Amino acid sequence: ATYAQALQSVPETQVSQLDNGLRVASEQSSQPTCTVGVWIDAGSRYENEKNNGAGYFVEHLAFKGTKNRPGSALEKEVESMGAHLNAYSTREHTAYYIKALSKDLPKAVELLADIVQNCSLEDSQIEKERDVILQELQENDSSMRDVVFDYLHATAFQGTPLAQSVEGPSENVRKLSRADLTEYVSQHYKAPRMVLAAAGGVEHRQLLDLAQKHFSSLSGTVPAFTPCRFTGSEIRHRDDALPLAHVAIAVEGPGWANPDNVPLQVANAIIGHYDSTYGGGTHMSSTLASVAATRKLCQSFQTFNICYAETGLLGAHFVCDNMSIDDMMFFLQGQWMRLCTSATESEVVRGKNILRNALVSHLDGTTPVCEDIGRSLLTYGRRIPLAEWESRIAEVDASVVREVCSKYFYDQCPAVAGLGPIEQLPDYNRIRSGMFWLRF
Amino acid sequence: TFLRWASEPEHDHRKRMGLKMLMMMGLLLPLVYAMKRHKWSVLKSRKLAYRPP
């Protein structure tokens, strides 16, 4: 088993398609557990200004009682057989997955059929949930990471649905009524926009039979989004009482398509990640992280690759004190243009290995495998096998990384979002000047 | 006019530099002004909002 043989030995993801348009897919294994869930193409990207937050609201209400299962009775099932019911709604995806035993798949799918089709939307339950969402919004206000990322989205995609947050404004939260929720679920939770993923010890034919027996009476056989526009801007929520200063700087990246994602991830793998409670410290190959550990510039930093259907954000997010924002902006831009102008071969090899490890280790356990299945059948349109990922990483070299970074980084207007004691944060002109090198 | 030339031998050449300078300044002032406006537009577009608790 020389790695490549191990990659070939990974079982494939069989994909089917119901008459209603449900893309039933499954990956068979030998584990005695399973994770089955539907991924829907709803989210804030498909939400208008007045509807903003309806997806989060309906996701909240989904588990709190159905039509056939009144209230906690549904929950009474999930705990009775040891299942873990969970959900998450991204800006472009929504999902409700139920961890269960391999022998509980016939029931679990049934529960899923109840959650997405025969929902309740009880008015009194809506009233109880409204204040809960308000308090959750207040809790997220203290989340200086999520707040900064929402600031980045708003200041990068201003004037487009992508700028909208997942939870939506509090005004919409209090305004939203049952009619809007049922209209939203009837318009977005359509069969062609749903994929019933199931990883673990589930046989694909059994999954197909269950889906045909439960998800049959869905929609027959329309929000298709609008191409959003990137607008290099900046938001400075100067608040000196905050202890640290979260900064996020991004550029218009690629989408789920546009294979340039694979080299680009490698570049991010070169920059890497670091925080105070790390290991080697002033020895890690990342020059950014090594310098940060040497001079203690920050408490954290990361490189994200948020990519949507047609566009996406590529950049970094660092958490540091008030007296070191300028230095880390300098070093981060220096690393970006070092990769842009002369990426070398050894760093590219290290990035390839890091990306290989990320993809391989991320896809362990039934939950990440099922999530990958559901997300890939929506974004890529196909569950990309790990062998294809290996080949695509292998094709990446120094010249490819330099070219792709030049395409996406060099002389590009970034979007900046700072929160906290960000007085040191250089003005947007200085950042944009850092986005190009005079020597080169 | 001969005495004027005797006083200012560089008269015609002075006017030649003057004409060239006029053209160059009429080309340069708008362009440097454009660069200044381009660099200062970042500031002259801010939408500062105050959001006290």
Automatic annotation (TrEMBL), chain A:
Keywords, alphabetical: Acetylation, Electron transport, Membrane, Mitochondrion, Mitochondrion inner membrane, Phosphoprotein, Respiratory chain, Transit peptide, Transport
The residue ranges of the Peptidase M16 C-terminal domain are: 175-355
The UniProt entry, under Pfam families, shows: Peptidase_M16, Peptidase_M16_C
Membrane protein topology class: Peripheral membrane protein
Q: The Peptidase M16 N-terminal domain covers which part of the protein?
A: 23-169
Q: Out of the domains of life, which is the source?
A: Eukaryota
A Gene Ontology term for the protein's cellular component = protein-containing complex
Q: Which Gene3D superfamilies match?
A: Metalloenzyme, LuxS/M16 peptidase-like (3.30.830.10)
This protein is called what? Answer: Cytochrome b-c1 complex subunit 1, mitochondrial
- Originating organism: Sus scrofa
Classification lineage: Eukaryota, Metazoa, Chordata, Craniata, Vertebrata
Q: Which gene encodes it?
A: UQCRC1
TrEMBL record, chain B:
Tell me the superkingdom of the source.
Answer: Eukaryota
The subcellular location is: Mitochondrion inner membrane
Entry similarity comment: Belongs to the cytochrome c family.
Subunit-level organization: Component of the ubiquinol-cytochrome c oxidoreductase (cytochrome b-c1 complex, complex III, CIII), a multisubunit enzyme composed of 11 subunits. The complex is composed of 3 respiratory subunits cytochrome b, cytochrome c1 and Rieske protein UQCRFS1, 2 core protein subunits UQCRC1/QCR1 and UQCRC2/QCR2, and 6 low-molecular weight protein subunits UQCRH/QCR6, UQCRB/QCR7, UQCRQ/QCR8, UQCR10/QCR9, UQCR11/QCR10 and subunit 9, the cleavage product of Rieske protein UQCRFS1.
This chain belongs to the protein called Cytochrome c1, heme protein, mitochondrial
Q: What is the lineage of its organism?
A: Eukaryota, Metazoa, Chordata, Craniata, Vertebrata
Relative to the complete UniProt sequence, the shown stretch is 273 to 325 of 326
